[PDB]
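Input for the complex:
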Amino acid sequence: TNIMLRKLITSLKKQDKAIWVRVAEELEAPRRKRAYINIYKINRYSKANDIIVVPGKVLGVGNLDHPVTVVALSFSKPAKEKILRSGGKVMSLYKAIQELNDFKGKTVRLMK
Amino acid sequence: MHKEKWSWTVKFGEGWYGKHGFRNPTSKLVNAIGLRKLQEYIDKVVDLAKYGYDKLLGGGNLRLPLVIKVAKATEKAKERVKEIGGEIILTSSE
Amino acid sequence: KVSVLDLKGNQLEEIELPLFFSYPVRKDLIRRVFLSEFTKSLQPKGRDPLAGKRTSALSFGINLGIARVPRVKGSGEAALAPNTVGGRLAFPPTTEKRLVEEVNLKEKKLGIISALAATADPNFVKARGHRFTSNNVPIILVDDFENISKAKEIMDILKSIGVVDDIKRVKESKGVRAGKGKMRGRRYQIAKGPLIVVSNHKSPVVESASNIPGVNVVSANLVSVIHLAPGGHPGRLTIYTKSSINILRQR
Amino acid sequence: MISSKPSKQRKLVYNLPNHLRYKLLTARLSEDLEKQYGIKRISIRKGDSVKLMRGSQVGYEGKVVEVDRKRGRVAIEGLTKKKADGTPVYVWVHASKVIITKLDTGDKERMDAIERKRKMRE
Amino acid sequence: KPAKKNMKSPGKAIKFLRFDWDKYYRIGRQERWRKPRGIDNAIRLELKGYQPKVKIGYRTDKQIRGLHPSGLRPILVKSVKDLEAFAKGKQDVIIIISSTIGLRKRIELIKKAEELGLKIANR
RNA sequence: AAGCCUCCCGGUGGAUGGCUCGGCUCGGGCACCGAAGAAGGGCGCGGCAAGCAGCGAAAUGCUCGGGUGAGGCGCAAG
RNA sequence: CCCGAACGGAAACAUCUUAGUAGGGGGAGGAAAAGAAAUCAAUUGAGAUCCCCUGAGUAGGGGCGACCGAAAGGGGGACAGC
RNA sequence: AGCAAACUAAGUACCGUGAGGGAAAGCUGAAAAGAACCCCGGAAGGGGGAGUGCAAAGAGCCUGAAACCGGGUGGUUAUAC
RNA sequence: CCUUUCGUCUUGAAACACGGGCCGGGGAGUUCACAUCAGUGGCGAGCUUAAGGAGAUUAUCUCCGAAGGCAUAGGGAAACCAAGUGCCCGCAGCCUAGUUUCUAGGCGAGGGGCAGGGUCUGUCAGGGCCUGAAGCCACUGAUGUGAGGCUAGAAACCGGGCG
RNA sequence: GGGUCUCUACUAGAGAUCCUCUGGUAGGGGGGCGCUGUGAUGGGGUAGAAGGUGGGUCGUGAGAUCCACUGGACCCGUCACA
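Predicted:
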């Protein structure tokens, strides 16, 4: 129903990396079953300066040790400032397509 | 029921019929907080009696050495606070 | 980035709008908030609770034949039933029906932001119907516009800044509507015109411009979706003052 | 602070009482009359001279010989129509379709009512 | 262009009228179709000698469907401002003037469409 | 000839469409009358007056103040 | 303010519910009634009555079946006392 | 339809010994200009010719459907569903 | 040349089964409350205001009002006690090599299996419930239940009056 | 119905191409037509409207639209809602 979520799904499918096609397929789940992740789980299953791709919303339960770059549909405002305060970065799925390192990124993890 | 819906009762209706036990008129009301949840008030000594908390539970664990004043605590909470370097004072009321 | 105009339409400044006005326009969200505020102004209707039942009609039974059916009839003639003439309604309207649609306060405030951005997009303003020859949208006027007191010299301002073509569009009143609405006081149907947002109520311009056909005046801290997107369609032509932007920046 | 319902507006004008029926008979004065009387409109009585501004007989000027205060119409001398047998009958024209050309100033209570309505000095 | 009568001319069309439209006038005067549902109904059962049921296999070729019999695409015009929005051009549309437009505006509406080269049905 | 089908014209009929000084629901005001005879009813009163409304043997209306300004004798045109 | 049902539901029905309802008799007013603790609750606190949102289908009653059902406390509106 | 009641008298007419029950029914036209006069008829907002009006479904008056009936057009009919 | 009279209950009925002369108009799953699912939207370890108060262009609108509710810890009749981690498989995806063409090899969020932990019970093994961090609110729809409850239909029973 | 692609401020439309499937009651599911009113609108139409009678054309269909006569003042397309 969202105009911008529909235009994002149509451009992810045009991408030629299986990572982005899987994100578009996952964003078409029923809203009641859409994916999300908390900060504590990103911390447990990652290393410093990783790249985490979440096909949903990032929520702020738990704490973060190491700096990471997280790519997600949306961020909770308490969760966004937890990530930046530990030295990390945040991008939207729209900007991650165009980024030059994200053109040919390495050490990328897909999480939920 | 017991006549024609008793096929439902014997399978999905345990406790539908009968009495079991009693209620205590004078049960003590206890407000419990765990170690995992204690890391927020609500965003060095911590006095938990001020916020209406009675017992401290084992939960997960803390991250800093703290002094906690509660009426009661669990055995796991007492030992895990010592490991970080904290200490628990059992004061029933401040 | 927009320019500020004086009462003669000349450019004299250059300011940057808050980041609210760059939000995407979400027609699904604006329709949620408009339909909620619309249903808050509806009154409860209902029928007479006893209409059709003010009788003691009863069934005659069987074996009469001439009492053609087991229907209720009062000494011969039909009464009380939903299929008979002069009987009761089967499901009459009642005052118990729920009319209002709620929205969350946080969801409402996002819908107002989305509508405020649609008035800064020239594509949505031209696609809603409005006619204007100004090259800048929205129009930002100096605060001396607050003190205009005569409806004749409001029209002189709208001509200079290039908005009076929307007044002519409105002034071609869409005459008498169709239906039973005209029987009930709803005789005409008029187009919507430019909207004026001012710093505070009680300013002179609130009353002076209240007669101009199609226009509405509202304070910067009261405005909502019913003003920005009437009918559910975003992009109403809007005029702001310099100090109404600062009041908006704090929401 | 009165009702905007069309049925409530029409029930007033069809049941208007005797002392308020003068409102149905209001007509515009000519430009020369308002020079020397200082008012813009007045109610019509028998004996005034009246000229038509609308209708199939526009421009016709005569004198008022009858009034219908319940409906707000006037009859002008010389503006008639003949029946089947040939006896003429009057053509009734609403008081809002005419402009008053001269008054009958002989009541002495109509005259000070006009003065009370702010004729300039006398 | 030559593919307009290969599907239409030989295949004269069925009317698809409601059951018992010829026995009762209350049913025959509607001249519309209603789906049979009776347990014993004979058009529902598709017996022999009983006027086919409505099915989706009766559609028309998609390349000629909905065209004016002159082979163009019909456009219903209610105002002179609808003429200025002519797509492509006069090569593929036929103009249908609205019935309620009065005689004085029709004179100016037909003149505008003539100079554009458009083709009018009810001229 | 009895006729039969279709359209046209007419009759009979009163659907459809349009209209509305009537209802229906909400808000807001306001809120007791009576032995100094109430509410409710019955009979009367108009030049010709049967009904409704108004009135009570002073009976389609009497007196005194104020407003209004030319017609008036209700529905209802003799 | 007194007197006071049955139909129906319980898949029958009598305790129960329906319901102190429907109804009957008496008495007012522009509002009535209530109203200044022989009250609540719990480590010594609050402070007349009434109405709204709650507490809450909780405590509790019941062929412990169908079903029935508070108060204190919290937030407000008005907030007098003789 | 909306209150049972938009109208020449609604709880009115009318029905019941009574407690009680309980209808139907709106619309000429902008203006009556509501059809003078002549022939027919016992008479009739009756017929015919006129006349009024933007227009006579002109008083049984806005529009005027179907069932039903009468007259006419086009096919056809007394050896056969 | 081909073709039995519509709707219906019913194995079939279906007709010597029932309702059906013609035409017009009317005529039957609706409302509220609670619960549970779904499609979407907002915020998110939180969510949400109710009654109400203030203002205003005065039944719309704006600001305030988290009281309470649901969720966040469970087990037990009760006294009372009180968790959230480590092993193995492994889909998607990522990396490496060959892209010969790819379960070839690593890493593997979500998922599965064994265990662990809290509490009741047993004299041990055991047995019951819980614990691997996602909910609340809104609109719309579906169903259950309660109210007349898709529409029509009893014989009856009771209260007060009238003969 | 499914696989593979294109375009569009997209609760949806418009297309290209390859494979396969086609009776149906109770019943479950997906899309559309029509009626009355409300907020809007590139929007419009009218003394020549709505309605009526007969007839053309479009659509599998519910339906849409036009022509001639009748009629004498109101009525429709699109988006959303009830």
